[PDB]
Design an enzyme around this catalytic site. Sequence first.
Site, PDB file in Angstrom:
ATOM      1  N   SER A 698       0.846  -1.194   0.000  1.00  0.00           N
ATOM      2  CA  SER A 698       0.000   0.000   0.000  1.00  0.00           C
ATOM      3  C   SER A 698       0.879   1.241   0.000  1.00  0.00           C
ATOM      4  CB  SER A 698      -0.977  -0.009   1.189  1.00  0.00           C
ATOM      5  OG  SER A 698      -1.782  -1.182   1.153  1.00  0.00           O
ATOM      6  N   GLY A 868      -4.713   0.713  -0.112  1.00  0.00           N
ATOM      7  CA  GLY A 868      -5.036  -0.543  -0.783  1.00  0.00           C
ATOM      8  C   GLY A 868      -5.394  -1.708   0.129  1.00  0.00           C
ATOM      9  N   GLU A 869      -4.568  -1.938   1.137  1.00  0.00           N
ATOM     10  CA  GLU A 869      -4.711  -3.084   1.993  1.00  0.00           C
ATOM     11  C   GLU A 869      -5.513  -2.823   3.261  1.00  0.00           C
ATOM     12  OE1 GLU A 869      -0.402  -3.467   1.581  1.00  0.00           O
ATOM     13  OE2 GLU A 869      -0.768  -5.644   1.466  1.00  0.00           O
ATOM     14  N   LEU A 870      -5.758  -1.555   3.612  1.00  0.00           N
ATOM     15  CA  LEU A 870      -6.553  -1.247   4.808  1.00  0.00           C
ATOM     16  C   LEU A 870      -7.869  -2.043   4.911  1.00  0.00           C
ATOM     17  CD1 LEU A 870      -7.017   0.320   7.454  1.00  0.00           C
ATOM     18  CD2 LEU A 870      -8.047   2.114   6.074  1.00  0.00           C
TER      19      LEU A 870
END
EC number: 1.2.99.7
Lengths: 907, 907
Positions: A698, A868-870
Amino acid sequence: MIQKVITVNGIEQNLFVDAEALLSDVLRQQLGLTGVKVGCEQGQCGACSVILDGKVVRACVTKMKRVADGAQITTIEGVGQPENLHPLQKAWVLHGGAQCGFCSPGFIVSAKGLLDTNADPSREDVRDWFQKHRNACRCTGYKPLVDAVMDAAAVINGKKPETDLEFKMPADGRIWGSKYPRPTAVAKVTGTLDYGADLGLKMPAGTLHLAMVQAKVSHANIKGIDTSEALTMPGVHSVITHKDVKGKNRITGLITFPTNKGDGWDRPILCDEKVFQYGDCIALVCADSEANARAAAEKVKVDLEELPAYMSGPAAAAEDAIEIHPGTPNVYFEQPIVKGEDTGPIFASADVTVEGDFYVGRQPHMPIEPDVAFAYMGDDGKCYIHSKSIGVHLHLYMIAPGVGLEPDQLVLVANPMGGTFGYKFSPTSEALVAVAAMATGRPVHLRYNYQQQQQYTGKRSPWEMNVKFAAKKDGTLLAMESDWLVDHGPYSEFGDLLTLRGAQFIGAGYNIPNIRGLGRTVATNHVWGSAFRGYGAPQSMFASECLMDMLAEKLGMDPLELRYKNAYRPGDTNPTGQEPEVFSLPDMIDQLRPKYQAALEKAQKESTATHKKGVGISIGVYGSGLDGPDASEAWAELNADGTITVHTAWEDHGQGADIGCVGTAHEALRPMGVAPEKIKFTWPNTATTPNSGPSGGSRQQVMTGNAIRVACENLLKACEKPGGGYYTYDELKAADKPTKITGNWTASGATHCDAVTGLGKPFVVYMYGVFMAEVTVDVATGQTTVDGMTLMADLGSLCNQLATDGQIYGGLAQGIGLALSEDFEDIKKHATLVGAGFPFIKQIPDKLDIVYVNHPRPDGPFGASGVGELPLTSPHAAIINAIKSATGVRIYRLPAYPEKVLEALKA
Amino acid sequence: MIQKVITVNGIEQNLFVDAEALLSDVLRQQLGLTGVKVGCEQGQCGACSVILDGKVVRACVTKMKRVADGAQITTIEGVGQPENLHPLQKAWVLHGGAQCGFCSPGFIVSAKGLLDTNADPSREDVRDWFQKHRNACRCTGYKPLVDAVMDAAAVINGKKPETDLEFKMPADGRIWGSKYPRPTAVAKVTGTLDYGADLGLKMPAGTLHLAMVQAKVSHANIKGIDTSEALTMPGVHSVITHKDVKGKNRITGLITFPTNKGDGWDRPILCDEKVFQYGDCIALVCADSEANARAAAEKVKVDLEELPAYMSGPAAAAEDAIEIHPGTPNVYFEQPIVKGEDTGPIFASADVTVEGDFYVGRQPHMPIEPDVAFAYMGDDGKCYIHSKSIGVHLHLYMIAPGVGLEPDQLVLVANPMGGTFGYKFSPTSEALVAVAAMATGRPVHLRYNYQQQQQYTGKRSPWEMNVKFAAKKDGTLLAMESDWLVDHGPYSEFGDLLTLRGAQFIGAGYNIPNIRGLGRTVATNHVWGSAFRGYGAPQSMFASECLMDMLAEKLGMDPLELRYKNAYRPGDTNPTGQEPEVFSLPDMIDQLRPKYQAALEKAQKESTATHKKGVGISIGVYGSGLDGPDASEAWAELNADGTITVHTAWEDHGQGADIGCVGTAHEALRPMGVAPEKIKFTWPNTATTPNSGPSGGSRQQVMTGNAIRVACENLLKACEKPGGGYYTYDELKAADKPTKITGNWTASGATHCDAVTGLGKPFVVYMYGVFMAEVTVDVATGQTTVDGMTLMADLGSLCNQLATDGQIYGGLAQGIGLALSEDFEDIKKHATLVGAGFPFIKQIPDKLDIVYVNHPRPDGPFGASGVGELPLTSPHAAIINAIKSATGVRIYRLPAYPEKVLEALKA
Ligand code: FES
Ligand code: FES
Ligand code: FES
Ligand code: FES
Ligand SMILES: [Cl-]
Ligand SMILES: [Cl-]
Ligand SMILES: [Cl-]
Ligand SMILES: [Cl-]
Ligand SMILES: [Cl-]
Ligand SMILES: [Cl-]
Ligand SMILES: [Mg+2]
Ligand SMILES: [Mg+2]
Ligand SMILES: [Mg+2]
Ligand SMILES: [Mg+2]
Ligand SMILES: [Mg+2]
Ligand SMILES: [Mg+2]
Ligand code: NA
Ligand code: NA
Ligand code: NA
Ligand code: NA
């Protein structure tokens, strides 16, 4: 063969076909309609949707014998084209429905079919339609697609003017923070963006098509390979084996940790001595077509001595286990976490302690587009590879020694791609295609089918976890103990790093002064580990966020309030001893609280004897960056035509590298008044774009966004006129002044985590969020339905809201899959979308709610963190916590399959 | 290989190409842009014209290395599409510029290039542009193309509204006689009509591509064939020889005359014992691509004993000559013409006699599209052939015994085709592709290149002629003597019939009571004879129309007035003793006379010492029909949707089978008020369309037009309601009444010409015309320029004026070529368009004038005769007569090459 005279996209076609041929092949290969996308090839994904005589059909499972003389067919090319867009295409662009774009043609054609039968659908009608027609999307969480259909329908119905489907520039002229559409959207919604398989069809004759000869056992010593029958088969050029590899025939992990017991050179390009997992590529057949290559690959005979295989971490980690890589222990890495005081005495004297054993498994990425790549020898003597790499520079160095090229003699390029969700942090097909291009001298193309995508790309690595908390009666955390075992399959790349993520993220979100823990990485014969969106956080935070609810239960405390008591505030440190950079968790919890209370009341009111409703909470945290002083570079160039090209290697999985570039550059260039359509982005290319780094962790918005900002600031300085204003290109060139200007940025405040203690400052920017899941459990069947998800998200500042909303919806949907349905455990049963539990539209609620609570980051560009990964950090913990709320049962080992829930309900 | 990112038709393309690849192949094969047509492959025809960075280039001679990164390319697909037509495309449709349509994409793209550089060109500017860019057309005579460019330019310039490029329905609602556009025009002008080579690209993988192994000597005994090296070559499936033929391996002439000395079974499918001409197909290589098949064909070794070859009629006819077909004399047919009294005594006592020796040679058809065909085994067990056949039923019976199939087991279909001008009255590739499909079981495709089109399709047969006239001082013809020798190459099909044409047409136009003559047909080793537009008339009437001018000269009479004295009037008979059906020649001469006198005066005034101007006249006559009681059949069907399909096998060379059908049907259906767009035509197919007969002998409008008229009259009767009005489809189906209704028509008044005397009534309808040519001869170089052509034409009644105007312009242009530049004598030098004297635009005057003087035919539908061959009957005689007028020299042996004219000027 038969002649069939039909109409395709309104034009009469005099077709000559095999009656047994698939309509998808006829349309793509015979007619060049590569807007008909093919993914699964099994009628399960809808990407190949076409309209045939008023019905929406999957072209990949429709044989030409089903197409009548005089039939009418419509593909995306017949819906609309650039500069002649259909309302559905315009709506898709406006609502940001094209992320990777691979499903966009199929959804749009399917939606036209819907609207031709029901002009004014409800949102539920739209959802029912996409469910029935099997239109699958892995990027968007479906909500933006439904939004687009509804908007288009209103226009087609005359209820609303078509001009309202066109973006309206904000009054301030600012595209940063706006819903400005992404540059690639038009191509995606018209089927005119060529993905790797599309490019294969458009390559010249004499391009060779490859098929893999793959291991059909999980572990073996290889004795020999017989290609003799294969060489006699139709269209076959040659068969490539390890003997044709000109370098080391190994991929290097490149950044293998010093305390790793292995050298990082364990992964072969083509198997030589051993098979390490089912699917390993032992040889490549080169032929005139994919079909002829595959047929011939079936005839290549491999003589193997099958060995006992270790198919889980605990099996491979047993003290007695035989070394899969002789000379290296199967448990090849350990990472301690040692913060504060010894935890034993603190647990002994604490008011309350809790402990749990948890498991998160081998989640499959399931992009709609299966892996594909090609390679050729350039006229310049270099080997070019075009693939789904999301780290072109990284992969160049991982594979160059193995293929036998110096780094300047190999070029990696990222094709447009239909999603990866991290699997392309690993090399998959790049070394294979390079070896074949080098050996033959010819262009080569390799397309995986969906079974190969499932079996023979990397996976989320399973973690077996034990986590313990000690706390005061008032809920204040005192100490944590942790143990985790990471099943990384046979190939070590980034496995040690993934294991370090457990030291960083187990228990993240809270002040925990005293921590003692240990992660261990183990080689197995199940699928090798590749990054999957969240990369260690989904495992880590499943454990700790479930354990927080267990602690709340044991205290008789509300689980949101327990989190509020402990959430990071000034003075606190995270598990690695670093101070958080912003403190937004209390704010987010305070703003969520009344919605949580209302949700609890609704669940109480609406529960019945058989359908029990519950509400669950979790926190998520993750870094934006690769560990330590990560960096990026961009070049900002004024072109002769007055446009500006922002050169980066920001790799686009589909998340929005294009719009991140344009939006960040636009904001940085505002002093010079540069219109967004004048700003161009570059596809990643190791020869002609800077080393911006991989799209993993991210990181790109922070790292490359800052590099873009700096490059643009530097271009402004280069263009500044003495006395005010800016020079034109012509004025600069006439004065022999530079027009292409570099910018770089480094996360200078960061340090790598220590090998002995795990302490450090690994990222300078983190992402923070709070999840709420609302579920219903049918207690007769054990089936859970997720009725709503909410994410409170602190992203600092939004570069583009279409991009961030979409990222969050997509991550939430993957969380629903991780919680309830997804795994890759059974090599054959889980090798299809349906078999592995892919979430189709009805599994994802229409109620996906986002609340941005943005605290600008000191080190982010214009205050931005990543996103992105949150949304996949812990949604599955919220969901499991909601099942517990609803029913009293806790699922410790994902996924919560109905039978597993039933067994727990009835125990 | 190289990556090139460019824009094609406004869309960015990420291309992967060989730098040495031809742009035509990349566009057609890699990108599917089959609107880029390829004919000559040598940069001489312009069919492959594309715009590259603002310049019009021939894609077939443009290698990809010449296409820069970021280049812009436009093909016809980027100019416009159906329902989004560019003004140029609309203008082409309105002006009838698409006959075969094969050149239409290239002219239109080229014209867009012109107009992008010169928005308001003069007609001469347009002509100069097409000359420079090598845009070649064999159908239209160029004038309609220039008309279309000028009209489009006016619209683009805002001088005229775009709606005026759309056809306006006449007030009477009548499309018979109008300029209604032809149904196929839109597809042709948009590049969306698939010709045979286009279909080849769109056939499935596993289609085999064929290459011919051809004789490279003119005459030989074959000893053996070695395929061993060829079988080892890339992509090769197999090699087919005579041993793989399942029938007689001979094509039958089918209607071989009883007095022919040969059996008509002389022509092999694949050579077995002998080579009879250069180019004969000895074997077929089957491979995965045309390129691989051709490469392998070069390696097939044929062991031959070369024999002395007879390369002209006189050589082969010598009493001593060795029989080319052992057992048959080389002179295999004679046709006498014996009308009235013995001519010897009449010549002896006549006031004036004249005699000449004349020659017309081996004219090559030179369609822009070279020959192409394909075949496959149907799922029904039948063998299907799709080719440029213009007589599908005829060719079925000519080839079925040779290929070894009963007639019901073979189906022939006419593809859309880019011109034939008669060469496709003969089988070319049909038996070859059938044999290969039968032998392999696989679909097969065979494309000739332009050299093969020239060398290995049939030709106009050369005639060596001597003709004599006896006349009174007042110009009244008394008698004619004639002798002609027809060089038919080695294959007899229709050679006897062609020779009979000399009895019918030498001296046609005039009352000649007494005739004694003899035609002889001879086999040679030069190219075999196939029909060429005019089929015996261009030879016959060259002789007699030149000889009429010689008679006028010897009498001191004006040559138009000599024709006026003798032209058919009531009571007269033609050479076969038959009364003409109408008498329009005096009318046409009277209407031409003042234009001829003015032309003479202009020539006198404008001649200079070095550039001598002249005016020449000729008459043309030809039958509409095949000889005797010719017939046709059509089916008129009311469809469920209220459209009407008129089922015929009216084969479309490009002359307008589509519009002939629609226009004739429309007129016949007027009582029921059927709109023209509701009338559908059928592509020829021997299984599913009636035996309407071949499109040869300018017959279809008369024969099939009458059958269509009758079928439509019968459909009206079937639909008539008692009490008035007409039933709908639904009403008829509910009453169990027929909806598909047959009609037939026969030319019952006709008789075949007698084998002993040549007398008979071979056609019931003829075409009549009067030509005027205006020329300039440069007496220093011998170069003739044709400055104007006029045709007075009696076509009875026009079905469609765009069709007839175009037919006439095209025929006049072919006449200019025949007169001045065209031949196929030198097997290699004349195997290119430029080498064989193809007329490019500057060779054809912009002044092509038509005057219709229509005398309705008693037996024609609504009074129509044919038109197709009328304009090539004698334009070349008018031109040679004009050279004589200008300079005093007479060219007796065509063509009038500059050196030949110079030698005559200086003698
Ligand atoms: S449903 Fe056809 S490719 Fe997936
Ligand atoms: S946008 Fe739907 S799968 Fe990527
Ligand atoms: S000029 Fe290119 S095909 Fe003739
Ligand atoms: S229309 Fe031009 S070649 Fe036929
Ligand atoms: Cl301890
Ligand atoms: Cl469990
Ligand atoms: Cl289950
Ligand atoms: Cl006589
Ligand atoms: Cl001569
Ligand atoms: Cl010459
Ligand atoms: Mg529209
Ligand atoms: Mg505190
Ligand atoms: Mg059970
Ligand atoms: Mg327009
Ligand atoms: Mg008389
Ligand atoms: Mg000379
Ligand atoms: Na194709
Ligand atoms: Na497989
Ligand atoms: Na193609
Ligand atoms: Na040849």
